[PDB]
Scaffold this motif. Structure first.
Motif: not given
Ligand SMILES: [Zn+2]
Ligand SMILES: OC[C@@H]1O[C@@H](O)[C@H](O)[C@H]1O
Ligand SMILES: [Zn+2]
Ligand SMILES: [Zn+2]
Ligand SMILES: [Zn+2]
Ligand SMILES: [Zn+2]
Ligand SMILES: [Zn+2]
Ligand SMILES: [Zn+2]
Length: 304
Positions: A251-253, A299-303
């Motif tokens: 989904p995110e890819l 609920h992923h987080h970003h760097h």
């Molecule tokens: Zn995102």
């Protein structure tokens, strides 16, 4: 249409098949012409597939590097061609600057840390040493290097816990058995076993049984991934602790492939969440798992 060229590591673990399924299904769902490829565990086949995508004039290439090293040339050949690169779960050992847009994956160091801290919290009042046996991942892959490192950081605060034996099992059930049986013969006493992917831990639990020994009580198993078969083992009691690695990147890819192809800004790294279960937790967690996971991923987080 949008053209995505994906090259996979292989299909060694249950996590890999879930990752593949999630990538192929998410492409249909989002509407992306996926040109998927399978290296079957050898970098030269992954390279070739990456090289063919350049010749096919695809819009965005994306792959999962089998091992950290060797990509320099090919990753520069994509930059020369102008096709952007989005990385998945495994990282690269590259020198050249801005050779990939973003990298979606997990924190393998904390996954190992989490396991090693579990071992230690459980063997706190240990009146005598505790023999840890480590079933390492494929030699060269980012998760295998990072998990080993993290697991040591977990154990480090307790000298009663010592890695009596450690050896590669290539993230398979075959290897997992082949190497575990060797530790059962060679090493005389084992108190707990750390499998860097529940798949090796499953092959290992067959070797625990096959040598008239009870898994989950005689020798305790602790692994990574939280796959169906793994989680079932824990629910029954053959395993003791599984730290969840999320395989549903698709989904995110797809979202990031649309953003990148268009040229919208994307964060430099995205890390998928993780949790861990004991037997009782895994029991209640087993029901609508594919929904619970797909929700966890959101609920992923970003760097940045
Ligand atoms: Zn995102
Ligand atoms: O790259 C992630 C790892 O690849 C798979 O082979 C393992 O099961 C998973 O933990
Ligand atoms: Zn499908
Ligand atoms: Zn270079
Ligand atoms: Zn299943
Ligand atoms: Zn979860
Ligand atoms: Zn952000
Ligand atoms: Zn962070």
């Amino acid at each position: 249409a949008l053209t995505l060229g994906f090259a996979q590591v292989g299909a060694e673990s249950g996590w890999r098949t879930a990752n593949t399924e999630s990538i192929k299904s998410a492409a249909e769902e989002a509407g992306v012409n996926l040109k998927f490829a399978d290296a079957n565990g050898e970098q030269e086949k992954q390279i070739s597939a990456i090289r063919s995508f350049i010749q096919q004039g695809v819009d965005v290439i994306a792959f999962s590097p089998v091992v950290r090293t060797g990509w320099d040339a090919v990753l520069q050949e994509t930059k020369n061609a102008g096709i952007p690169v989005i990385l998945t779960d495994r990282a690269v050992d590259t020198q050249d600057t801005d050779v990939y847009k973003t990298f979606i994956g997990a924190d393998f160091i904390e996954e190992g840390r989490r396991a090693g801290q579990w071992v230690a919290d459980q063997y706190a009042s240990a009146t005598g040493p505790v023999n840890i046996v480590q079933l390492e991942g494929t030699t060269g892959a980012d998760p295998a290097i990072d998990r080993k490192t993290g697991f040591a950081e977990g154990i480090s605060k307790n000298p009663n816990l010592k890695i009596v034996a450690s050896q590669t099992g290539d993230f398979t059930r075959s290897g997992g058995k082949q190497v575990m049986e060797a530790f059962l013969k060679s090493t005389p006493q084992i108190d707990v076993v750390f499998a860097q992917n529940d798949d090796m831990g499953l092959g290992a639990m067959e070797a625990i049984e096959a040598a008239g020994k009870k898994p989950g009580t005689d020798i305790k198993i602790v692994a990574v991934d939280a796959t169906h078969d793994g989680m079932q083992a824990l629910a029954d009691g053959k395993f003791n602790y599984i730290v969840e690695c999320n395989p549903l990147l698709g989904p995110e890819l797809m979202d990031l492939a649309k953003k990148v192809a268009a040229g919208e800004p994307v964060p430099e790294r995205v890390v998928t969440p993780d949790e861990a279960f004991d037997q009782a937790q895994a029991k209640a967690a087993l029901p609508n798992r594919q929904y619970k996971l797909a929700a966890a991923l959101e609920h992923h987080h970003h760097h940045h």
